[PDB]
Design a protein around this motif. Sequence first.
Motif: not given
Length: 277
Positions: A54-55, A58-59, A61-62, A65, A131, A157-159
Amino acid sequence: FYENYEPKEILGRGVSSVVRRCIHKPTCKEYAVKIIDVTGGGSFSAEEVQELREATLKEVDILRKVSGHPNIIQLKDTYETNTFFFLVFDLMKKGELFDYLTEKVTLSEKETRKIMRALLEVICALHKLNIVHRDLKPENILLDDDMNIKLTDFGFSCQLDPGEKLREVCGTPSYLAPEIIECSMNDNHPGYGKEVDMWSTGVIMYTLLAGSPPFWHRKQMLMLRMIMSGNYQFGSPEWDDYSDTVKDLVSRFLVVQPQKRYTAEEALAHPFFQQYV
Ligand SMILES: Nc1ncnc2c1ncn2[C@@H]1O[C@H](COP(=O)(O)OP(=O)(O)OP(=O)(O)O)[C@@H](O)[C@H]1O
Ligand SMILES: [Mn+2]
Ligand SMILES: [Mn+2]
């Protein structure tokens, strides 16, 4: 992955991954591939493996982005199997800013202004999109042929949704903002947000100039206490040759109270960056 790329030598390694130079078979062009082993090992319990999957997502994904910024690493390709993730990025030849600082010992104020300007512009872009990087450090800032900075490693990182706060403690302790340490100490703490990037940016800029960390100690315990109190100083034997202007800038980042700390947009507007207006 291996059907389209020929894996070369190791460029780096992380807690759960390996970064290798690689060759894109069709084009024969070289890239870097961060291979993440989601299954890891012992502490990677049935649940842990999924924590990583999942992490990584996300990585990626960012990465997707922020793709397109002149100073952020560009994700070019990805691959996934029941165990590994394969992230393909452009190859950063001049390596890490950390490596560079290692050789240079410290950097001039003019060079640092070059790097900081680019870095702040990147963070400003990340923050504009809400982010938070959470792992800003020399090791995560790479260099290209022209020595231009490339922000990498969006693994923490996290949005954020408007008003969303974080509470997890992750990243190198020396670069951890006070809020992060506070949060871990007390559950009744409001959690943290984007401002942590700005503290890290402070630690970074300071180390570039001084060739050493603003906060450090033999025992992590006291080091953290120092960070929390914000007890750092512009060492008498080093900081002599630098202008006070830079010292004012550095001090505006190293502000324990998030609300009173400089933002990327403020930092860029500081005197230090206004010579040609
Ligand atoms: N595009 C790239 N070009 C050159 N080498 C790179 C590239 N990306 C990564 N490397 C090298 O591999 C190292 C690890 O990359 P990265 O930071 O993404 O891994 P990580 O496992 O997430 O790191 P960490 O242990 O800090 O969490 C970098 O510090 C760098 O030396
Ligand atoms: Mn890293
Ligand atoms: Mn990482």
